[PDB]
DNA sequence: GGCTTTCGTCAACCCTTTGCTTATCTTCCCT
DNA sequence: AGCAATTTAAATAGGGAAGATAAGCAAAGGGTTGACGAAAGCC
RNA sequence: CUUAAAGAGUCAACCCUUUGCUUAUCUUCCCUAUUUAAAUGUUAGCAGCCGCAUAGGCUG
């Protein structure tokens, strides 16, 4: 920690060319931190899309003009061609930010539904998202055991279409690193 | 510490603790109202930032003071905090490594004697001596430690880093915490398909990997909501001990997440420490 | 005398009406003992000359308690009129004098 | 990867409590291993191990003497003596509510496995006792060790048998370390040359003296490893736990 | 030639008076 | 036709008496639960 | 195919009687419950008289 892991992940993604990735992170605030790093280093909202699907009421006080912080939800971005095959032209704000994002800095639960769902059509949007985009999962050790199982299911599904999985965990256990490699290998 | 009532027990003991030290106590668990919780976060991030000396102005560093933050595993995940020292209630070894990462995270000065004091037992030993590390840990009913003494299951003096988690040991998992951790990790995330496993094949066709392997599997979790100072369910606001509280932010809106088990009794929300059993 | 009563001072309320104990009165009847050693004021007739308030027993440790004078009289030691009157006063006070 | 079927609250009465000459009480693990191989024969589901626990168990009699059984005149040729009371050979009787958990390997649905075990148990006989009642058996699987403990805790409430081993002999340690002795198997003495008076004429027969191991009763949830409660036929003409000696 | 009935044959104690174990419970997290 | 306000503190202490006794009877039963060996009619 | 296989414990009852737990007790001292304030919400749905009306209108 403290060495700039997420910046190194973006560097590794950009080494192969232009970036198309889903930064799936635990917690809302860690996604906010990675979004703020992406904003102040080089990434605008035409490429980045911070997705936290709860609409929290945590606002910044003191000075709105002198903030230079509090990464928000606008996504000027670019609507992908996949929105025409989704129901009713995808959706409003949230699913447009999901599907059409080049870089999707999101909470992870908007990506683990790609592996499948019980009832409804909630699988298709993260499925089609992870089909054409890379997957970057940071500090996977903080998740639960079943959470890590479904995250490696997501890694297997992402590798099923040739995309690249970046795992960023310092305290990795050989077991975890191995089963994530075996999911990527399958 | 491990859980919320454990945190308020450590807080209520330390507040009533007579000493010459100027203890200033904070509670940092997850059961808090929208406003109060967010306020704790921003304050803690701006006082524990030790890459510069900007914090000297967010706390009273003029007077010798012990600024103590009693927290649950919400501090060891995703927090850019830098404490001078930590006292850890043992639940898992990755908790030890992460709370080591909350001490001297921003500085580079080496400690001289000892900067982490690990407790002898988790507090669930006095409540359940059969199993005590299952809360926020990989101990469970199928993987039981033979002894719960941390002299038996951990090194008495140890340089805590990622090395013990990085190495990986499957032998002697019943009397060491690290090998207990590694055992569970290879016995649940295995190269099989099972039904709740990771290579799942044949079952993707079925609804089984989405029912028996539930993402964010938590307890029932109902949400008692504070509406403008007036609580919804069986909450009953209370008064904290006002002995050593350094900072206490008030809250009026927001919601608290209470497990259905603790819904039976009053969660007794308080401005200083959120939920407990009283 | 009260303990767990959530009330600091009770009063003897015979059917609500304020009253004082019979033992309070009967102690004040037998406050006639002016025949102990440092005899300045009458004290209550007790086998030891004992008072709860002053924390001292005026007839203890100096061979003028009721038990030694009772043993003496019984045996044959002529009790002085004041000692005799003290022993008689403790007898009409009452109490177990065995052991 | 392990599969189990549990029959909970198996109320059985008329149990032949005479486990051996020196043990009277709970039937040993040879009895329940014999019950397991009995279903391996009638139902065809081949059983590796059985973990059995005692919910309730009372030996019929007083605290120092068992209630003997009034024998019936059933031998041939002793008519004329039939009016008098038949002589009593020692066979104590007992009642017991048990919980059984059979390690099976099955390849069909759980409903036909439950039906096969139910059809066996309806014609079974625990330790010579008629099965008075039993709950509907349920199938649970032990994929991992936490799942093994799930099966373990599904036998609640019952006191399972854990093996604690023989140090010197049976009487000494039963007084000293206070553990219970039971038949873990038998010792073969002589080959039997007369197969005329036996169940089969082709199955080889031996006179046997019961070997015993020393065991303890622990509640199934307080048992750390479920393999230390699953008894199975060992290859020493004995039975043994999968987890070995309980420590 | 067994075979089945009934009658005769051979014995002799030092006892003690409940526990065995003791039941399958919530931290993160975001939706 | 619902609205009923907030904090703050709930007493320190001294005592809970010893001396006596706590029955003596008389009962508490046995009745069946025997297998080999040996005469001795009997197919 | 489980020390497998098998087995009726039956019966009967008089616990009696007797009794002295008495004795004497000082609870007691102490003291600030203090300070506020719109009841608003139309706050009333009436009295006659024009009429067959308990339909509908008028009068203040």
Short mmCIF file of N, CA, C and O in Angstrom, two decimals, chain B residues 136-230:
data_model
loop_
_atom_site.label_atom_id
_atom_site.label_comp_id
_atom_site.label_asym_id
_atom_site.label_seq_id
_atom_site.Cartn_x
_atom_site.Cartn_y
_atom_site.Cartn_z
N UNK B 136 -15.54 -12.22 12.13
CA UNK B 136 -14.48 -11.55 11.37
C UNK B 136 -13.22 -12.40 11.26
O UNK B 136 -12.10 -11.89 11.32
N UNK B 137 -13.39 -13.72 11.10
CA UNK B 137 -12.27 -14.61 10.93
C UNK B 137 -12.67 -15.87 10.18
O UNK B 137 -13.86 -16.14 9.98
N UNK B 138 -11.66 -16.63 9.77
CA UNK B 138 -11.89 -17.87 9.05
C UNK B 138 -11.95 -19.11 9.94
O UNK B 138 -12.00 -20.22 9.41
N UNK B 139 -11.93 -18.96 11.26
CA UNK B 139 -12.33 -20.08 12.09
C UNK B 139 -13.82 -20.32 11.91
O UNK B 139 -14.59 -19.40 11.61
N UNK B 140 -14.23 -21.57 12.07
CA UNK B 140 -15.63 -21.95 11.86
C UNK B 140 -15.89 -23.28 12.54
O UNK B 140 -15.05 -23.79 13.29
N UNK B 141 -17.06 -23.85 12.27
CA UNK B 141 -17.43 -25.13 12.88
C UNK B 141 -16.70 -26.30 12.24
O UNK B 141 -16.53 -27.33 12.90
N UNK B 142 -16.27 -26.18 11.00
CA UNK B 142 -15.53 -27.24 10.36
C UNK B 142 -14.03 -27.13 10.55
O UNK B 142 -13.30 -28.11 10.35
N UNK B 143 -13.57 -25.95 10.95
CA UNK B 143 -12.15 -25.67 11.11
C UNK B 143 -11.98 -25.05 12.50
O UNK B 143 -12.05 -23.83 12.65
N UNK B 144 -11.76 -25.89 13.50
CA UNK B 144 -11.66 -25.47 14.88
C UNK B 144 -10.22 -25.53 15.34
O UNK B 144 -9.53 -26.53 15.12
N UNK B 145 -9.75 -24.45 15.96
CA UNK B 145 -8.44 -24.47 16.59
C UNK B 145 -8.47 -25.36 17.82
O UNK B 145 -9.43 -25.34 18.60
N UNK B 146 -7.42 -26.16 17.99
CA UNK B 146 -7.32 -27.03 19.16
C UNK B 146 -7.14 -26.21 20.43
O UNK B 146 -7.74 -26.52 21.46
N UNK B 147 -6.34 -25.16 20.37
CA UNK B 147 -6.17 -24.22 21.46
C UNK B 147 -6.51 -22.82 20.98
O UNK B 147 -6.28 -22.49 19.81
N UNK B 148 -7.07 -22.01 21.86
CA UNK B 148 -7.39 -20.63 21.54
C UNK B 148 -6.38 -19.65 22.11
O UNK B 148 -6.54 -18.44 21.94
N UNK B 149 -5.34 -20.15 22.77
CA UNK B 149 -4.29 -19.30 23.31
C UNK B 149 -3.40 -18.79 22.18
O UNK B 149 -2.92 -19.58 21.36
N UNK B 150 -3.16 -17.48 22.15
CA UNK B 150 -2.34 -16.94 21.07
C UNK B 150 -0.85 -17.12 21.32
O UNK B 150 -0.06 -16.84 20.42
N UNK B 151 -0.45 -17.56 22.51
CA UNK B 151 0.91 -18.08 22.64
C UNK B 151 1.05 -19.41 21.92
O UNK B 151 2.11 -19.71 21.37
N UNK B 152 -0.02 -20.22 21.92
CA UNK B 152 0.02 -21.49 21.22
C UNK B 152 -0.15 -21.34 19.71
O UNK B 152 0.47 -22.08 18.94
N UNK B 153 -0.97 -20.39 19.27
CA UNK B 153 -1.33 -20.27 17.86
C UNK B 153 -0.69 -19.08 17.17
O UNK B 153 -0.98 -18.82 15.99
N UNK B 154 0.18 -18.34 17.86
CA UNK B 154 0.88 -17.24 17.22
C UNK B 154 2.23 -17.05 17.91
O UNK B 154 2.43 -17.51 19.04
N UNK B 155 3.14 -16.39 17.21
CA UNK B 155 4.44 -16.08 17.79
C UNK B 155 4.30 -14.99 18.85
O UNK B 155 3.52 -14.05 18.68
N UNK B 156 5.05 -15.14 19.94
CA UNK B 156 4.95 -14.19 21.05
C UNK B 156 5.54 -12.84 20.67
O UNK B 156 4.90 -11.80 20.87
N UNK B 157 6.74 -12.83 20.10
CA UNK B 157 7.30 -11.67 19.43
C UNK B 157 7.36 -11.95 17.94
O UNK B 157 7.94 -12.97 17.53
N UNK B 158 6.79 -11.07 17.13
CA UNK B 158 6.80 -11.31 15.70
C UNK B 158 6.77 -10.00 14.94
O UNK B 158 6.04 -9.08 15.31
N UNK B 159 7.56 -9.92 13.88
CA UNK B 159 7.48 -8.80 12.95
C UNK B 159 6.33 -9.10 12.01
O UNK B 159 6.40 -10.01 11.19
N UNK B 160 5.24 -8.34 12.14
CA UNK B 160 4.04 -8.59 11.36
C UNK B 160 4.15 -7.89 10.02
O UNK B 160 4.27 -6.66 9.95
N UNK B 161 4.12 -8.68 8.95
CA UNK B 161 4.09 -8.18 7.59
C UNK B 161 3.21 -9.14 6.79
O UNK B 161 2.51 -9.98 7.36
N UNK B 162 3.28 -9.04 5.47
CA UNK B 162 2.48 -9.91 4.62
C UNK B 162 3.11 -11.28 4.42
O UNK B 162 2.51 -12.11 3.73
N UNK B 163 4.27 -11.54 5.03
CA UNK B 163 5.06 -12.75 4.77
C UNK B 163 4.32 -14.00 5.23
O UNK B 163 4.29 -15.02 4.52
N UNK B 164 3.69 -13.93 6.41
CA UNK B 164 2.96 -15.09 6.94
C UNK B 164 1.74 -15.42 6.08
O UNK B 164 1.39 -16.59 5.93
N UNK B 165 1.09 -14.40 5.53
CA UNK B 165 0.00 -14.66 4.60
C UNK B 165 0.51 -15.03 3.21
O UNK B 165 -0.16 -15.78 2.49
N UNK B 166 1.68 -14.53 2.82
CA UNK B 166 2.19 -14.81 1.49
C UNK B 166 2.73 -16.23 1.37
O UNK B 166 2.69 -16.81 0.28
N UNK B 167 3.24 -16.80 2.46
CA UNK B 167 3.94 -18.08 2.39
C UNK B 167 2.99 -19.22 2.07
O UNK B 167 3.12 -19.89 1.04
N UNK B 168 2.02 -19.47 2.95
CA UNK B 168 1.06 -20.52 2.69
C UNK B 168 1.44 -21.84 3.33
O UNK B 168 2.35 -22.52 2.85
N UNK B 169 0.76 -22.21 4.40
CA UNK B 169 1.03 -23.46 5.11
C UNK B 169 -0.28 -24.17 5.38
O UNK B 169 -1.20 -23.59 5.96
N UNK B 170 -0.36 -25.44 4.97
CA UNK B 170 -1.54 -26.24 5.23
C UNK B 170 -1.41 -27.12 6.47
O UNK B 170 -2.43 -27.49 7.06
N UNK B 171 -0.19 -27.46 6.86
CA UNK B 171 0.02 -28.30 8.03
C UNK B 171 -0.09 -27.48 9.31
O UNK B 171 0.20 -26.28 9.32
N UNK B 172 -0.50 -28.16 10.39
CA UNK B 172 -0.68 -27.59 11.73
C UNK B 172 -1.67 -26.42 11.72
O UNK B 172 -1.41 -25.35 12.27
N UNK B 173 -2.82 -26.64 11.09
CA UNK B 173 -3.85 -25.61 11.04
C UNK B 173 -4.70 -25.57 12.30
O UNK B 173 -5.43 -24.59 12.50
N UNK B 174 -4.64 -26.60 13.14
CA UNK B 174 -5.44 -26.63 14.35
C UNK B 174 -4.77 -25.95 15.53
O UNK B 174 -5.40 -25.79 16.58
N UNK B 175 -3.50 -25.54 15.40
CA UNK B 175 -2.85 -24.82 16.48
C UNK B 175 -1.97 -23.67 15.98
O UNK B 175 -0.99 -23.32 16.64
N UNK B 176 -2.31 -23.07 14.84
CA UNK B 176 -1.72 -21.81 14.43
C UNK B 176 -2.74 -21.07 13.58
O UNK B 176 -3.49 -21.70 12.82
N UNK B 177 -2.77 -19.74 13.71
CA UNK B 177 -3.79 -18.95 13.03
C UNK B 177 -3.54 -18.86 11.53
O UNK B 177 -4.48 -18.91 10.74
N UNK B 178 -2.27 -18.72 11.14
CA UNK B 178 -1.93 -18.55 9.73
C UNK B 178 -2.23 -19.81 8.93
O UNK B 178 -2.80 -19.74 7.83
N UNK B 179 -1.88 -20.98 9.48
CA UNK B 179 -2.18 -22.22 8.77
C UNK B 179 -3.66 -22.53 8.80
O UNK B 179 -4.16 -23.19 7.88
N UNK B 180 -4.38 -22.06 9.83
CA UNK B 180 -5.84 -22.15 9.81
C UNK B 180 -6.43 -21.33 8.67
O UNK B 180 -7.31 -21.81 7.94
N UNK B 181 -5.92 -20.11 8.48
CA UNK B 181 -6.34 -19.25 7.38
C UNK B 181 -6.08 -19.91 6.04
O UNK B 181 -6.97 -19.97 5.18
N UNK B 182 -4.86 -20.38 5.82
CA UNK B 182 -4.53 -20.94 4.52
C UNK B 182 -5.36 -22.18 4.24
O UNK B 182 -5.82 -22.36 3.12
N UNK B 183 -5.58 -23.01 5.26
CA UNK B 183 -6.39 -24.21 5.09
C UNK B 183 -7.76 -23.88 4.53
O UNK B 183 -8.15 -24.42 3.50
N UNK B 184 -8.50 -23.00 5.19
CA UNK B 184 -9.83 -22.61 4.73
C UNK B 184 -9.79 -22.09 3.30
O UNK B 184 -10.61 -22.47 2.47
N UNK B 185 -8.82 -21.24 2.99
CA UNK B 185 -8.72 -20.66 1.66
C UNK B 185 -8.53 -21.70 0.54
O UNK B 185 -9.04 -21.51 -0.56
N UNK B 186 -7.81 -22.78 0.80
CA UNK B 186 -7.67 -23.82 -0.22
C UNK B 186 -8.79 -24.85 -0.15
O UNK B 186 -8.96 -25.64 -1.08
N UNK B 187 -9.56 -24.85 0.93
CA UNK B 187 -10.62 -25.85 1.10
C UNK B 187 -11.98 -25.31 0.72
O UNK B 187 -12.99 -26.01 0.83
N UNK B 188 -12.03 -24.06 0.27
CA UNK B 188 -13.29 -23.48 -0.16
C UNK B 188 -13.12 -22.95 -1.56
O UNK B 188 -14.03 -23.06 -2.39
N UNK B 189 -11.96 -22.38 -1.85
CA UNK B 189 -11.68 -21.92 -3.20
C UNK B 189 -10.80 -22.99 -3.82
O UNK B 189 -9.61 -22.77 -4.02
N UNK B 190 -11.39 -24.15 -4.11
CA UNK B 190 -10.61 -25.25 -4.66
C UNK B 190 -10.83 -25.39 -6.16
O UNK B 190 -11.74 -24.77 -6.71
N UNK B 191 -10.01 -26.20 -6.82
CA UNK B 191 -10.14 -26.41 -8.26
C UNK B 191 -11.21 -27.42 -8.64
O UNK B 191 -11.05 -28.16 -9.61
N UNK B 192 -12.31 -27.45 -7.90
CA UNK B 192 -13.40 -28.36 -8.22
C UNK B 192 -14.58 -27.56 -8.71
O UNK B 192 -14.52 -26.33 -8.77
N UNK B 193 -15.66 -28.25 -9.07
CA UNK B 193 -16.86 -27.55 -9.50
C UNK B 193 -17.88 -27.53 -8.38
O UNK B 193 -18.65 -26.58 -8.28
N UNK B 194 -17.88 -28.56 -7.52
CA UNK B 194 -18.85 -28.66 -6.42
C UNK B 194 -20.22 -28.10 -6.73
O UNK B 194 -20.95 -28.65 -7.57
N UNK B 195 -20.59 -27.01 -6.07
CA UNK B 195 -21.87 -26.36 -6.32
C UNK B 195 -21.70 -24.92 -5.88
O UNK B 195 -22.37 -24.02 -6.37
N UNK B 196 -20.83 -24.72 -4.89
CA UNK B 196 -20.57 -23.37 -4.40
C UNK B 196 -19.11 -23.10 -4.68
O UNK B 196 -18.51 -22.23 -4.06
N UNK B 197 -18.55 -23.84 -5.63
CA UNK B 197 -17.13 -23.68 -5.90
C UNK B 197 -16.79 -22.69 -6.99
O UNK B 197 -17.63 -21.88 -7.38
N UNK B 198 -15.58 -22.76 -7.50
CA UNK B 198 -15.14 -21.76 -8.46
C UNK B 198 -15.02 -22.20 -9.92
O UNK B 198 -15.11 -21.37 -10.83
N UNK B 199 -14.84 -23.50 -10.15
CA UNK B 199 -14.75 -23.99 -11.52
C UNK B 199 -16.11 -24.33 -12.08
O UNK B 199 -16.18 -24.92 -13.15
N UNK B 200 -17.15 -24.07 -11.26
CA UNK B 200 -18.55 -24.40 -11.61
C UNK B 200 -18.87 -24.70 -13.04
O UNK B 200 -18.82 -23.83 -13.92
N UNK B 201 -19.19 -25.95 -13.30
CA UNK B 201 -19.52 -26.35 -14.64
C UNK B 201 -20.72 -27.23 -14.52
O UNK B 201 -20.78 -28.07 -13.63
N UNK B 202 -21.70 -27.00 -15.36
CA UNK B 202 -22.89 -27.80 -15.34
C UNK B 202 -23.90 -27.15 -14.45
O UNK B 202 -25.10 -27.31 -14.63
N UNK B 203 -23.42 -26.39 -13.49
CA UNK B 203 -24.33 -25.76 -12.58
C UNK B 203 -24.59 -24.35 -13.03
O UNK B 203 -25.49 -23.72 -12.52
N UNK B 204 -23.83 -23.85 -13.99
CA UNK B 204 -24.11 -22.52 -14.46
C UNK B 204 -25.44 -22.60 -15.14
O UNK B 204 -26.19 -21.64 -15.12
N UNK B 205 -25.75 -23.73 -15.74
CA UNK B 205 -27.07 -23.91 -16.31
C UNK B 205 -28.16 -23.79 -15.27
O UNK B 205 -29.26 -23.33 -15.59
N UNK B 206 -27.89 -24.18 -14.03
CA UNK B 206 -28.87 -24.16 -12.96
C UNK B 206 -28.76 -22.86 -12.18
O UNK B 206 -27.85 -22.05 -12.39
N UNK B 207 -29.70 -22.66 -11.27
CA UNK B 207 -29.71 -21.50 -10.39
C UNK B 207 -28.91 -21.74 -9.12
O UNK B 207 -28.89 -20.87 -8.25
N UNK B 208 -28.28 -22.91 -9.01
CA UNK B 208 -27.53 -23.27 -7.81
C UNK B 208 -26.35 -22.36 -7.44
O UNK B 208 -26.22 -22.07 -6.24
N UNK B 209 -25.47 -21.90 -8.34
CA UNK B 209 -24.37 -21.03 -7.88
C UNK B 209 -24.81 -19.64 -7.46
O UNK B 209 -24.00 -18.91 -6.87
N UNK B 210 -26.05 -19.24 -7.73
CA UNK B 210 -26.55 -17.94 -7.30
C UNK B 210 -27.42 -18.03 -6.06
O UNK B 210 -27.76 -16.99 -5.49
N UNK B 211 -27.80 -19.24 -5.64
CA UNK B 211 -28.59 -19.43 -4.44
C UNK B 211 -27.73 -19.88 -3.26
O UNK B 211 -27.81 -19.30 -2.18
N UNK B 212 -26.91 -20.90 -3.46
CA UNK B 212 -26.07 -21.43 -2.40
C UNK B 212 -24.75 -20.70 -2.26
O UNK B 212 -24.09 -20.85 -1.22
N UNK B 213 -24.35 -19.93 -3.26
CA UNK B 213 -23.18 -19.05 -3.17
C UNK B 213 -23.70 -17.64 -3.37
O UNK B 213 -23.77 -17.13 -4.49
N UNK B 214 -24.08 -17.00 -2.27
CA UNK B 214 -24.71 -15.69 -2.30
C UNK B 214 -23.66 -14.61 -2.12
O UNK B 214 -22.91 -14.62 -1.14
N UNK B 215 -23.61 -13.68 -3.07
CA UNK B 215 -22.69 -12.56 -2.98
C UNK B 215 -23.17 -11.57 -1.92
O UNK B 215 -24.34 -11.19 -1.91
N UNK B 216 -22.24 -11.14 -1.06
CA UNK B 216 -22.50 -10.38 0.17
C UNK B 216 -23.54 -11.08 1.04
O UNK B 216 -24.64 -10.56 1.28
N UNK B 217 -23.26 -12.32 1.40
CA UNK B 217 -24.19 -13.08 2.21
C UNK B 217 -24.10 -12.51 3.59
O UNK B 217 -23.08 -12.67 4.26
N UNK B 218 -25.14 -11.83 4.01
CA UNK B 218 -25.15 -11.28 5.34
C UNK B 218 -26.35 -11.78 6.10
O UNK B 218 -27.07 -12.64 5.62
N UNK B 219 -26.56 -11.23 7.28
CA UNK B 219 -27.72 -11.60 8.06
C UNK B 219 -28.93 -10.85 7.53
O UNK B 219 -28.78 -9.98 6.67
N UNK B 220 -30.12 -11.17 8.02
CA UNK B 220 -31.34 -10.52 7.57
C UNK B 220 -31.24 -9.01 7.39
O UNK B 220 -31.68 -8.51 6.36
N UNK B 221 -30.71 -8.30 8.37
CA UNK B 221 -30.48 -6.86 8.25
C UNK B 221 -31.64 -5.93 7.92
O UNK B 221 -31.83 -5.55 6.78
N UNK B 222 -32.40 -5.53 8.93
CA UNK B 222 -33.46 -4.56 8.73
C UNK B 222 -32.87 -3.20 9.03
O UNK B 222 -31.85 -3.11 9.69
N UNK B 223 -33.46 -2.13 8.53
CA UNK B 223 -32.85 -0.83 8.73
C UNK B 223 -33.67 0.12 9.55
O UNK B 223 -34.68 0.64 9.09
N UNK B 224 -33.24 0.36 10.77
CA UNK B 224 -33.92 1.31 11.60
C UNK B 224 -33.49 2.66 11.09
O UNK B 224 -32.30 2.90 10.97
N UNK B 225 -34.43 3.54 10.76
CA UNK B 225 -34.09 4.83 10.16
C UNK B 225 -34.36 6.03 11.04
O UNK B 225 -35.44 6.18 11.60
N UNK B 226 -33.37 6.89 11.19
CA UNK B 226 -33.54 8.09 11.98
C UNK B 226 -34.09 9.15 11.08
O UNK B 226 -33.48 9.50 10.08
N UNK B 227 -35.26 9.66 11.43
CA UNK B 227 -35.86 10.71 10.63
C UNK B 227 -35.92 11.97 11.44
O UNK B 227 -36.74 12.06 12.35
N UNK B 228 -35.06 12.93 11.13
CA UNK B 228 -35.08 14.21 11.81
C UNK B 228 -35.04 14.11 13.31
O UNK B 228 -35.78 14.79 14.00
N UNK B 229 -34.18 13.25 13.84
CA UNK B 229 -34.03 13.16 15.27
C UNK B 229 -34.96 12.18 15.91
O UNK B 229 -34.77 11.80 17.06
N UNK B 230 -35.96 11.74 15.16
CA UNK B 230 -36.92 10.81 15.70
C UNK B 230 -36.68 9.45 15.09
O UNK B 230 -36.74 9.29 13.88
#
